[PDB]
mmCIF file of C-alpha atoms in Angstrom:
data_model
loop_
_atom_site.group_PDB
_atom_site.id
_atom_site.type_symbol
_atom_site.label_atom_id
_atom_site.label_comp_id
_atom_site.label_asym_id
_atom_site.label_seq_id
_atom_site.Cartn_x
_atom_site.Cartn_y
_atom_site.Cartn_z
ATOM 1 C CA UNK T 1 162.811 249.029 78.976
ATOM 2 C CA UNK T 2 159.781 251.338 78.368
ATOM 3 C CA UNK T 3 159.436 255.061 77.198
ATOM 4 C CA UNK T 4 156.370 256.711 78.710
ATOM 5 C CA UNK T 5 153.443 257.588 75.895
ATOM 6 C CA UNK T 6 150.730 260.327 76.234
ATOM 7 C CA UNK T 7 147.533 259.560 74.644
ATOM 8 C CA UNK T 8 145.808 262.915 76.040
ATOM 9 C CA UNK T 9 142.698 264.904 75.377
ATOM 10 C CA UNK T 10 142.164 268.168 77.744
ATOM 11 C CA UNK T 11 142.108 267.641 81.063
ATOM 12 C CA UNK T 12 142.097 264.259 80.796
ATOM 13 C CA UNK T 13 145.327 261.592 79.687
ATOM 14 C CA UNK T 14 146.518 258.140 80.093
ATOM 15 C CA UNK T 15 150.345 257.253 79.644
ATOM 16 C CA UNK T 16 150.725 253.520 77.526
ATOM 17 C CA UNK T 17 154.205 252.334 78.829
ATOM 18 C CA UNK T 18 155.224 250.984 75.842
ATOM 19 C CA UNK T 19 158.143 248.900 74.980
ATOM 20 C CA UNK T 20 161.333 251.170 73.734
ATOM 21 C CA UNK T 21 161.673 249.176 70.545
ATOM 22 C CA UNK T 22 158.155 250.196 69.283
ATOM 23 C CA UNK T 23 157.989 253.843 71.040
ATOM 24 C CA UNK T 24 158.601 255.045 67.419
ATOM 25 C CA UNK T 25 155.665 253.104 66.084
ATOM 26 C CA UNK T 26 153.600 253.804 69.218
ATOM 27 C CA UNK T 27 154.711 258.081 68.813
ATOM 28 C CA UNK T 28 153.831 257.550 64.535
ATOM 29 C CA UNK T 29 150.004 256.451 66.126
ATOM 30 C CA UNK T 30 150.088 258.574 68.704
ATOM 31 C CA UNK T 31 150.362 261.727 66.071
ATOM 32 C CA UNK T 32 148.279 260.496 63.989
ATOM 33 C CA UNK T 33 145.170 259.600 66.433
ATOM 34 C CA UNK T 34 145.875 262.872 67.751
ATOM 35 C CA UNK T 35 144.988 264.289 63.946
ATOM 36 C CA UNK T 36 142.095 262.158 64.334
ATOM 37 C CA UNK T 37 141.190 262.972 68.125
ATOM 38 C CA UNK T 38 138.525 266.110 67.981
ATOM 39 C CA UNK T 39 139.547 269.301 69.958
ATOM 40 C CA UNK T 40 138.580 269.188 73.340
ATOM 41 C CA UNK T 41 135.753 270.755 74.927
ATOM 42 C CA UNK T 42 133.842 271.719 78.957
ATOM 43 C CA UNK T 43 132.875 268.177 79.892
ATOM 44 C CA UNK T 44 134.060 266.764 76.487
ATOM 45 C CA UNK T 45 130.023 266.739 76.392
ATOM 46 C CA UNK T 46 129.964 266.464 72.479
ATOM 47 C CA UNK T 47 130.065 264.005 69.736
ATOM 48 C CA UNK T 48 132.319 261.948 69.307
ATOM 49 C CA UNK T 49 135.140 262.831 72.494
ATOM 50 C CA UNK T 50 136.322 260.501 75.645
ATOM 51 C CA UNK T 51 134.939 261.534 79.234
ATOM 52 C CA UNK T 52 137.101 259.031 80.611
ATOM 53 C CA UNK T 53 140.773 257.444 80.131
ATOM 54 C CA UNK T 54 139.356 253.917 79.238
ATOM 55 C CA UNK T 55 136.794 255.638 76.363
ATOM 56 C CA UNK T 56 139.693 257.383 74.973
ATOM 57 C CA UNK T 57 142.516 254.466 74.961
ATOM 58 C CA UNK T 58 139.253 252.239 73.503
ATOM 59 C CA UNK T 59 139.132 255.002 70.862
ATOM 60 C CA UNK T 60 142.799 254.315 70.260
ATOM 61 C CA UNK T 61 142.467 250.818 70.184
ATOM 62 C CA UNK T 62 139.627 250.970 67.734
ATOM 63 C CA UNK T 63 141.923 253.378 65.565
ATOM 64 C CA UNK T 64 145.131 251.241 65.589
ATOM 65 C CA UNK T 65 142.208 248.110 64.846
ATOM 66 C CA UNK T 66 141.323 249.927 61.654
ATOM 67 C CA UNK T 67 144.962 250.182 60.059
ATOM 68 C CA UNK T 68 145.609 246.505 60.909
ATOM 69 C CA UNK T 69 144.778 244.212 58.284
ATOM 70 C CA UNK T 70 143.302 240.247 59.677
ATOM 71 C CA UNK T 71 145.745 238.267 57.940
ATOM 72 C CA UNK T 72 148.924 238.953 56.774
ATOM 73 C CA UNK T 73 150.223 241.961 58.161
ATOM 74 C CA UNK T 74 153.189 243.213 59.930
ATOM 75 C CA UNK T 75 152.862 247.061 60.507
ATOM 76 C CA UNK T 76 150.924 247.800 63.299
ATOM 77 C CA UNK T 77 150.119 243.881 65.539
ATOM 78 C CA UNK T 78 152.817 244.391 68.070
ATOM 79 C CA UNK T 79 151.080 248.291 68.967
ATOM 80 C CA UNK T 80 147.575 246.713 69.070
ATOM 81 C CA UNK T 81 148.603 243.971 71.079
ATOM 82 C CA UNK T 82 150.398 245.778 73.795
ATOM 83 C CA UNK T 83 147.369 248.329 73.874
ATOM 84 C CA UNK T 84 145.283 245.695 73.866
ATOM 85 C CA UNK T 85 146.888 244.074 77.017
ATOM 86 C CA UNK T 86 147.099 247.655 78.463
ATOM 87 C CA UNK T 87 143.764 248.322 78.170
ATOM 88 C CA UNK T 88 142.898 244.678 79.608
ATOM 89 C CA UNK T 89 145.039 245.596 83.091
ATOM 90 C CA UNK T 90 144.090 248.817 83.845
ATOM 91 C CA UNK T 91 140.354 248.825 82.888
ATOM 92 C CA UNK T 92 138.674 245.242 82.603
ATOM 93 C CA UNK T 93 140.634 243.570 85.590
ATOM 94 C CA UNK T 94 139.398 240.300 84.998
ATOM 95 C CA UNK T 95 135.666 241.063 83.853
ATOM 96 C CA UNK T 96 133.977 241.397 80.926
ATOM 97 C CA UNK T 97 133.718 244.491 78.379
ATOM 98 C CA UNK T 98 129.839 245.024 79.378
ATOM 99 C CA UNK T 99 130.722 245.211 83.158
ATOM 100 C CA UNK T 100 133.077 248.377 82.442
ATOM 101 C CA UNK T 101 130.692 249.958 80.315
ATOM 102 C CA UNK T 102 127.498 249.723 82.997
ATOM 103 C CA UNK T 103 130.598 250.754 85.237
ATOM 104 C CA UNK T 104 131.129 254.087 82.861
ATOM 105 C CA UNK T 105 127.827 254.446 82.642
ATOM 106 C CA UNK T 106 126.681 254.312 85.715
ATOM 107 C CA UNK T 107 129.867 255.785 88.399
ATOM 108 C CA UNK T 108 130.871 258.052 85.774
ATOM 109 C CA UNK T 109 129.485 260.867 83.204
ATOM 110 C CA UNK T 110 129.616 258.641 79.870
ATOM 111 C CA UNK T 111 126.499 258.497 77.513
ATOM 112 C CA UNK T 112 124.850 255.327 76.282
ATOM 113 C CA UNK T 113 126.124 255.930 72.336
ATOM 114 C CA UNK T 114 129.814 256.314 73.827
ATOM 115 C CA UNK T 115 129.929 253.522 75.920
ATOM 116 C CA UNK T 116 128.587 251.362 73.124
ATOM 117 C CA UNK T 117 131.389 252.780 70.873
ATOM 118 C CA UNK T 118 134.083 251.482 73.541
ATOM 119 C CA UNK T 119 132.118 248.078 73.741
ATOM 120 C CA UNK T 120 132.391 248.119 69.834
ATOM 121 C CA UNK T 121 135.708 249.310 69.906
ATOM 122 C CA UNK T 122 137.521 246.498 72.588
ATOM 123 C CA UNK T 123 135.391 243.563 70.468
ATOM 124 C CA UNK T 124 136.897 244.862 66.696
ATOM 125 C CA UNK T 125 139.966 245.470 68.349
ATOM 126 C CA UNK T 126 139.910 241.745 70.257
ATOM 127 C CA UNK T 127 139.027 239.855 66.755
ATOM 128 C CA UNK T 128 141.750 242.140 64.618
ATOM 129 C CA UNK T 129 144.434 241.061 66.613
ATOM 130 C CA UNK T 130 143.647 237.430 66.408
ATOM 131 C CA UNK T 131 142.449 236.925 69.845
ATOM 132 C CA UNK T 132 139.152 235.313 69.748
ATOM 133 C CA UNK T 133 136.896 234.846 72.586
ATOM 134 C CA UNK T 134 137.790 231.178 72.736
ATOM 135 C CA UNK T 135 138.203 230.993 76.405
ATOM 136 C CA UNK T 136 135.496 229.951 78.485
ATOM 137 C CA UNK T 137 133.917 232.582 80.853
ATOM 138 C CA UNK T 138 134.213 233.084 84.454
ATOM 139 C CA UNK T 139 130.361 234.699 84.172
ATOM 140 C CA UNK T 140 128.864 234.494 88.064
ATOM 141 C CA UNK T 141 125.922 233.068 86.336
ATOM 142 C CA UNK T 142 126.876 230.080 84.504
ATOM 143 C CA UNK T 143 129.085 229.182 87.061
ATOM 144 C CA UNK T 144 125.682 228.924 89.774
ATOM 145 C CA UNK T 145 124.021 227.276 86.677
ATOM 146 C CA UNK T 146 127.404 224.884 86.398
ATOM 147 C CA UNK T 147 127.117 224.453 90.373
ATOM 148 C CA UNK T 148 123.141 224.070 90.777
ATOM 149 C CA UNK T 149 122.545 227.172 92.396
ATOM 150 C CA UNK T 150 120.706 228.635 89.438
ATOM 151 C CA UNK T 151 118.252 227.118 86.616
ATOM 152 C CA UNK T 152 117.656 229.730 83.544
ATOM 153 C CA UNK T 153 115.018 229.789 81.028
ATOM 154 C CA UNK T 154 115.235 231.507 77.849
ATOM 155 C CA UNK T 155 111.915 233.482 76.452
ATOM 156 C CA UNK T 156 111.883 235.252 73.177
ATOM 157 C CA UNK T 157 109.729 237.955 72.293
ATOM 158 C CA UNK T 158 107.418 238.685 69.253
ATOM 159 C CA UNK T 159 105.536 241.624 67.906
ATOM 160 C CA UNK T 160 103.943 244.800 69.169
ATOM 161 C CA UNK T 161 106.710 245.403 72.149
ATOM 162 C CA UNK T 162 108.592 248.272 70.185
ATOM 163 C CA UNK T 163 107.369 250.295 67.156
ATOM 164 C CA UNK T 164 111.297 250.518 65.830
ATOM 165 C CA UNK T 165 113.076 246.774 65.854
ATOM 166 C CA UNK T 166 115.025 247.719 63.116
ATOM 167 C CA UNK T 167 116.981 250.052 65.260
ATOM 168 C CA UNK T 168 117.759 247.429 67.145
ATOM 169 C CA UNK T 169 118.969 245.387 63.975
ATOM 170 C CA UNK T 170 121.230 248.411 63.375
ATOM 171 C CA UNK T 171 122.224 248.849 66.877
ATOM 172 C CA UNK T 172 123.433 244.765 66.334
ATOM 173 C CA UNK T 173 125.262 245.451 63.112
ATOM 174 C CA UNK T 174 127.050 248.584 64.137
ATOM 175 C CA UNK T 175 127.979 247.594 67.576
ATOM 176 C CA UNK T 176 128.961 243.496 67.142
ATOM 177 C CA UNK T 177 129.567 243.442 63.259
ATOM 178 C CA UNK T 178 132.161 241.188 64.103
ATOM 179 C CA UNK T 179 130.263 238.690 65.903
ATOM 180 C CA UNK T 180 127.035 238.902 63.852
ATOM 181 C CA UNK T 181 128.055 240.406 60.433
ATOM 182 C CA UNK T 182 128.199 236.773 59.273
ATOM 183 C CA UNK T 183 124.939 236.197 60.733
ATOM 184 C CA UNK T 184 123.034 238.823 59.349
ATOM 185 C CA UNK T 185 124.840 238.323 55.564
ATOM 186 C CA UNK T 186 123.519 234.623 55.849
ATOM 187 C CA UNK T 187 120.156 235.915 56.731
ATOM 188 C CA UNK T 188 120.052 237.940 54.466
ATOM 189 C CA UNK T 189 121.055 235.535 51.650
ATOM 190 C CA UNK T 190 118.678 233.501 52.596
ATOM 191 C CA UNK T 191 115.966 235.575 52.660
ATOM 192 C CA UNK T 192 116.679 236.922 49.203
ATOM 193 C CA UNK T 193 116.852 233.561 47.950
ATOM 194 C CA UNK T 194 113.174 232.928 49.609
ATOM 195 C CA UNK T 195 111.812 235.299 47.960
ATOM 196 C CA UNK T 196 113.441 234.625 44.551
ATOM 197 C CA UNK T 197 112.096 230.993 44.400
ATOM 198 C CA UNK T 198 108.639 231.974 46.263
ATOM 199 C CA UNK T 199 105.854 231.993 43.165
ATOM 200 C CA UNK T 200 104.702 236.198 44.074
ATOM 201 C CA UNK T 201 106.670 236.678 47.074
ATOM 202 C CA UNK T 202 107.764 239.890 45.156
ATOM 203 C CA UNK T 203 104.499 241.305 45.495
ATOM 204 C CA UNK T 204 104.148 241.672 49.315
ATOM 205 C CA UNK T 205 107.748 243.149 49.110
ATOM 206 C CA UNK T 206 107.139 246.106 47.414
ATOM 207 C CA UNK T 207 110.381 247.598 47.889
ATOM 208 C CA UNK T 208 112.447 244.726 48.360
ATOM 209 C CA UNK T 209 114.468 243.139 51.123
#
């Protein structure tokens, strides 16, 4: 029992076979990321616009991730789930998020900010819907390291390699909030606290931190 949906932009559409008891909930999204969905354009080479299914049903998914609410909440689970699982079968196969986005990037005509906006998208969307990455990977490397056919060595760099880091920073916080928001909320904590208890540490930060 499903009633074909249309999430389409120009020349360019993917149908969400969703089950016929929600199709009313799915259509109510549907409008409403179609609102949100900018007018099409040659190439859809402009901000913020899919070039491919899979960017476009990740925009969805990050949509119907924003109107859910972690926690209690009843409105819109079922929608994200099934998209969710949609999105899973007929774009990740079994791999990982990153693989489909070198795969977009590469194959296809998808820019880096886009592709990092469907990476962003499929993680929010994962952690809304209560479905952590709690499951151990199937990663090609850790199962050579697991087998002894690899040994890996982590280096970390320092200073001098890049002249903006901070980009990076923001790159982190805009593309993984939900994996690092914590992180960087602790650091930062902790950092203000340093320099709150440090005699003149207030001095060499001029303009705070």
């Amino acid at each position: 029992s499903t009633r074909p949906l249309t999430l389409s932009h120009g020349s360019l559409e993917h149908v969400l076979l969703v089950p016929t008891a929600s199709f009313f909930i799915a259509s109510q999204l549907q409008e409403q990321f179609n609102k949100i969905l900018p007018e099409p354009t040659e190439g859809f080479a402009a901000d913020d616009e899919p070039t491919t299914p899979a960017e476009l049903v990740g925009k969805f998914l990050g949509y119907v991730s924003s109107l859910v609410e972690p926690s209690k909440v009843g409105q819109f689970d079922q929608v994200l789930n099934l998209c969710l699982t949609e999105f899973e079968n007929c774009y990740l196969e079994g791999n990982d998020i990153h693989a489909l986005a070198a795969k977009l990037l590469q194959e296809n005509d998808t820019t880096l900010v886009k592709t990092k906006e469907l990476i962003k998208n499929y993680i929010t969307a994962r952690i809304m819907a209560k479905r952590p990455f709690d499951k151990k990977s199937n990663s090609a490397l850790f199962r050579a390291v697991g087998e002894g056919n690899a040994q890996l060595v982590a280096i970390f760099g320092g200073q001098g390699n890049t002249d903006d880091y901070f980009e990076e920073l923001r790159d982190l916080y805009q593309t993984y909030h939900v994996l690092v928001g914590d992180l960087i909320k602790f650091s930062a904590e902790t950092l203000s606290e340093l320099i709150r208890t440090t005699l003149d540490a207030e001095k060499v930060f001029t303009q705070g931190l």
